[PDB]
Design a protein around this ligand. Structure first.
Ligand SMILES: CCN(c1nc(Nc2ccc3c(c2)S(=O)(=O)NC3)ncc1F)c1cccc2[nH]ncc12
Length: 270
């Protein structure tokens, strides 16, 4: 738990949501001050499900340590409940690509490879992300991406490779694999499907997937074996990798170790 007197928040808001606000701030470390992004719960954190999601996200972040995952500084209980993270200055990947339409193919491949390295680590650590979308990739620099938003993330049981939800909740269905929608089962292979959607978003410069379709229509499209087309100018090898991520059968779909290998821009052995 952090010291409010060591935290300073900017008057301006960095972003906003139904949970409350996101503010840029500064936190006093051993010697230097560190730039932070702070999620601040609305109405003094009176929504108990908001408070519980904040604490669950913090509990997951405390266990993670990887260069391609946003680092948590901690929780601050003061005027409201705050979750303090190391600032990724350039913000969400989808907004960045919407605003920077000339980012080169090699650079997009570099960034999605970094996401695959963080996901390979999460898979090895037996956590499922469950909200892997371009909006949840944050840029430290134009050449360094980190994964964020672990609000739906789960630590897998020791005897299973999936988290079983009781039924369908309010979910980012356009990023979910068929086994998620049909059987409520979430594995690292389910995150690989989401990663294929994230890839499609990155090469479509932050366009939304399955434009104009209802969730039920997406499910029927996928069950028919249909998939989104190749984004204009997307390298064929990257579109082929999206299609492999969108393998219907969870057993035949690659895991992140296999996907990360396919995103390397150097010779290697399997
Ligand atoms: C996306 C908000 N965000 C961060 N945000 C940034 N940078 C950042 C930088 C710029 C902008 C934004 C965020 S915005 O709010 O989406 N709009 C502009 N860096 C690290 C961050 F951790 C967060 C803060 C606290 C808890 C969090 N959980 N998941 C994300 C998150």
């Amino acid at each position: 738990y952090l010291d409010r007197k060591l935290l300073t928040l900017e008057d301006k808001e960095l972003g906003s949501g139904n949970f409350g606000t996101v503010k840029k701030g500064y936190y006093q470390m051993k010697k230097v001050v560190k730039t932070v992004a702070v999620k601040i719960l609305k109405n003094e954190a009176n929504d108990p499900a908001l408070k519980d999601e904040l604490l669950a996200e913090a509990n997951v972040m405390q266990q993670l340590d990887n260069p391609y995952i946003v680092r948590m500084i901690g929780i601050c209980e003061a005027e409201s409940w705050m979750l303090v993270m190391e600032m990724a200055e350039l913000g969400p990947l989808n907004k960045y690509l919407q605003q920077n339409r000339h980012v080169k193919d090699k650079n997009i491949i570099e960034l999605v490879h970094q996401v695959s390295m963080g996901m390979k680590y999460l898979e090895e650590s037996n956590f499922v992300h469950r909200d892997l979308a371009a909006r949840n990739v944050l840029l430290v620099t134009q050449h360094y991406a980190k994964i964020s938003d672990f609000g739906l993330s789960k630590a897998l049981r020791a005897d299973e490779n999936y988290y079983k939800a009781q039924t369908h909740g309010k979910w980012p269905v356009k990023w979910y694999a068929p086994e998620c929608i049909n059987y409520y089962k979430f594995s690292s292979k389910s995150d690989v499907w989401s990663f294929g959607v994230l890839m499609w978003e990155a090469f479509s410069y932050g366009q939304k997937p399955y434009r104009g379709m209802k969730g039920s229509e997406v499910t029927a499209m996928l069950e028919k074996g249909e998939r989104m087309g190749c984004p204009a100018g997307c390298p064929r090898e990257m579109y082929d990798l999206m299609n492999l991520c969108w393998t219907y059968d969870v057993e035949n779909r690659p895991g992140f170790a296999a996907v990360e290998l396919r995103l390397r821009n150097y010779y290697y052995d399997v």
